Amino acid sequence: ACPTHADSLNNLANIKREQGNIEEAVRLYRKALEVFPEFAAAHSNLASVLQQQGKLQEALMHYKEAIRISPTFADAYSNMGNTLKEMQDVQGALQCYTRAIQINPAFADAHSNLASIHKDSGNIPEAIASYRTALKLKPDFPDAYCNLAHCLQIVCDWTDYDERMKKLVSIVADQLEKNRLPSVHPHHSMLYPLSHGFRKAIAERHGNLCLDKINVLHKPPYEHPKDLKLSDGRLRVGYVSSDFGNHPTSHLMQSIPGMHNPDKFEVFCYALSPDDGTNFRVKVMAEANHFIDLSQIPCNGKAADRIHQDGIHILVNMNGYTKGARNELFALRPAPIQAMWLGYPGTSGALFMDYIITDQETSPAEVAEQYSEKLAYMPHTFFIGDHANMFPHLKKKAVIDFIYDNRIVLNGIDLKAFLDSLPDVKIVKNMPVIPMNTIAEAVIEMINRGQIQITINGFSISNGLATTQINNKAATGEEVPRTIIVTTRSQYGLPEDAIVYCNFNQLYKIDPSTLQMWANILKRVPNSVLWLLRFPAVGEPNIQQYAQNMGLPQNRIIFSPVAPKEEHVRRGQLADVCLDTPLCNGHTTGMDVLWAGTPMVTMPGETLASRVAASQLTCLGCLELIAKNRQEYEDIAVKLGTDLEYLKKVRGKVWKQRISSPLFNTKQYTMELERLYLQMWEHYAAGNKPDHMI
Amino acid sequence: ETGTTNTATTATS
Ligand SMILES: CCCC(=O)NCCCCCC(=O)N[C@H]1[C@@H](OP(=O)(O)OP(=O)(O)OC[C@H]2O[C@@H](n3ccc(=O)[nH]c3=O)[C@H](O)[C@@H]2O)O[C@H](CO)[C@@H](O)[C@@H]1O
Ligand SMILES: CCNC(=O)CCc1ccc2n1[B-](F)(F)n1c(C)cc(C)c1C2
């Protein structure tokens, strides 16, 4: 009836949407549609705010109405693509973006949204190409600039790096001042030189999005247990994770549910992911007191009701802002105590989180300001790994004298029996050494010939590069390998007569400053090499180009492919020293390299993510590997690479202390986690709100 | 997954 009036109502709705008044936007778009039912722009604009409230099906219905009314409405197609992408319909999203760009070639938002599919598929050069098209058409485009910056970080393109970081910080500042959702993702924010205040505000605004989605449910506050009477004096602990399956989180904590004291604790595991069929999933399902698949319960209201009805005292957030998170569940507060643990190396910034489980080394008291949560300290490190259970063949080793601990390495469950079948095995202060006999030449020939395995004295001797051909489950870490495995520097092109510095982290953890520190070390330690991973492969030529410009020849940096889990951990035995990334430390990869007995040099920063390595080394008991500044990092690394007596001493310390220290003791860890859980409970039950447990 | 950008349509002329 009146397009002009509907049109004013649509514009007013748009102004309200900008101001963050989403409920008022919805009210005004709906009145525009009463005044002009066939108003395509109102259907599409309304669908977008419905998408913000998690009403994806109702959004889809309005987008389809917009396109029914206006078949070449580019905005409706690009907006509908966003809703489909969130519904995990990547195919439909692509059709929508491609259709929006068919219609309007100059549509910056649609190029940026298409870039987001390329990014999410792993196609980073194509994501870069599309983001760059978006920024050429719309130079003021925070979402495209911030996502481009993350793409450039993944592939180690440091073109104009310091000016890039300045514009990132500037965009965040402007979005925080104007009360807009920052275009920098909280998880991504750990890679950029943002103030603690900006990192915490980014987190806080993302946490606050969960409310747009739970507010439309009109759920009242839950009533919480105030004692353990209903649960027989047992504390009900709920572990909420997308990562119960073949995921690093499971490779760290798969043992902890099973190891809880069932006299004091009732363990519930809330999976946000379907069953991926792996032993990781099998074990947590079998060893938890209860296992609830919330992938089956997509409504956060019904899912939260289920947690509340189970009687949970401490609900544990293992995702934070990682893939698969359903922080909406935490936003509804189905549990009286809600704690961040292990999955996310930073603050939620979120009203609905009470505690972050951390430690004095990771999160010292003077940086409490960085976190919205109260600090809950584990006694040594909050970090834990399942290495003792997953990889017990790496508990012991033997070498072939071709005396080096890390040129040719044997590992196996039956290693001692195999060695006892040989007549000429020496020991060293202990390390068994096979001399260059018939057996040794056979083992080496297998490696040089690229053979899968041989038999010696009835014992299966397997090529460490061929584990997936031998036992696919042994390759993933789902089972212990049953053969004796040979690992050699020759398998990876590493020099026999020079120091190997390694870093097995995603390349996005490297910045120019870090590669310059590494170059400084290599130039002080002749013939040494840096061993890095194709993580991903497209990052490799960038690193090489930067390293060559710093004076390092291509042959000083050795790249390997990312390996199946068991080979990645096993081959860390071939390194002399791990050089930790100061920007964001190795977390999982720190535990991995230490389990192989490789010393790791670290420079802790201020962020949780920049201090995990120092916390791991403190728990291990190797303070000599923690640097106070860049000069000290370079000095420690150079000393380990030039003084072979000191190297041997530091390597022995790590080799012994990975067993004797608490670092990999999941039984002691679980016992200390239980102490902390009952201190949180006792504090809540006496009627206190959260406080630091330090 | 990567965040996307919704386009607010204002109708024109
Ligand atoms: C593509 C987007 C990524 C992104 O933007 N993130 C940037 C922010 C990083 C912040 C740090 C963080 O999230 N840390 C958590 C993470 O531990 P991690 O050591 O950083 O990462 P991974 O666990 O992914 O480490 C690599 C995994 O792959 C295994 N590996 C490695 C090399 C190889 O050749 N083969 C192989 O299998 C390696 O064993 C490991 O499993 O995740 C942890 C677990 O959830 C968190 O505890 C940690 O804080
Ligand atoms: C055999 C070849 N396959 C691999 O290299 C395994 C790891 C891998 C496969 C595809 C990708 N990544 B990535 F490096 F983890 N990766 C990272 C860290 C970011 C991106 C874009 C990727 C893409």
Side-chain angles (χ1 to χ4, degrees), chain A residues 119 150 154 187-191 243 247-252 318 322 342-345 382-383 504-506 508-509 533 535 561-566 568-569 571 584-590 592 608-609 612:
Chain A
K119 193 173 191 262
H150 194 237
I154 292 162
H187 198 202
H188 302 170
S189 75
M190 292 169 198
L191 302 176
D243 303 327
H247 183 285
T249 301
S250 286
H251 308 160
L252 301 182
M318 298 175 66
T322 50
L342 188 66
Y344 187 74
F382 82 101
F383 222 78
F504 298 153
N505 302 349
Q506 305 91 336
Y508 57 71
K509 294 192 184 179
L533 304 184
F535 217 164
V562 172
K565 182 81 184 202
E566 186 281 333
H568 148 68
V569 180
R571 72 181 177 187
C584 175
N585 307 164
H587 296 166
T588 310
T589 51
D592 297 339
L608 190 173
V612 162

Side-chain angles (χ1 to χ4, degrees), chain A residues 74-185:
Chain A
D75 295 348
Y77 281 103
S78 171
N79 296 339
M80 182 165 59
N82 300 334
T83 291
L84 290 181
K85 185 205 159 125
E86 187 169 352
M87 285 162 146
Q88 304 298 323
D89 178 8
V90 164
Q91 299 204 219
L94 267 165
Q95 283 303 318
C96 288
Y97 300 142
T98 56
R99 196 68 200 110
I101 293 146
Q102 273 190 338
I103 293 151
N104 176 2
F107 193 4
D109 293 354
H111 286 295
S112 188
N113 302 331
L114 175 59
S116 79
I117 300 303
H118 296 318
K119 193 173 191 262
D120 284 358
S121 78
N123 192 355
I124 305 303
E126 204 66 68
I128 292 169
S130 292
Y131 282 127
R132 268 168 182 162
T133 298
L135 290 161
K136 181 191 183 83
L137 297 162
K138 192 168 99 184
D140 182 5
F141 197 175
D143 287 345
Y145 188 85
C146 294
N147 286 312
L148 174 55
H150 194 237
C151 289
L152 291 172
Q153 186 88 20
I154 292 162
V155 305
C156 292
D157 174 343
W158 306 323
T159 294
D160 202 20
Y161 194 71
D162 299 326
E163 290 299 315
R164 191 190 306 164
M165 296 303 99
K166 282 195 198 178
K167 187 167 166 153
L168 283 182
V169 171
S170 183
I171 293 165
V172 169
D174 180 66
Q175 294 178 319
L176 292 173
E177 154 141 36
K178 319 241 136 129
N179 310 300
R180 264 67 187 279
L181 183 72
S183 291
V184 172
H185 188 282

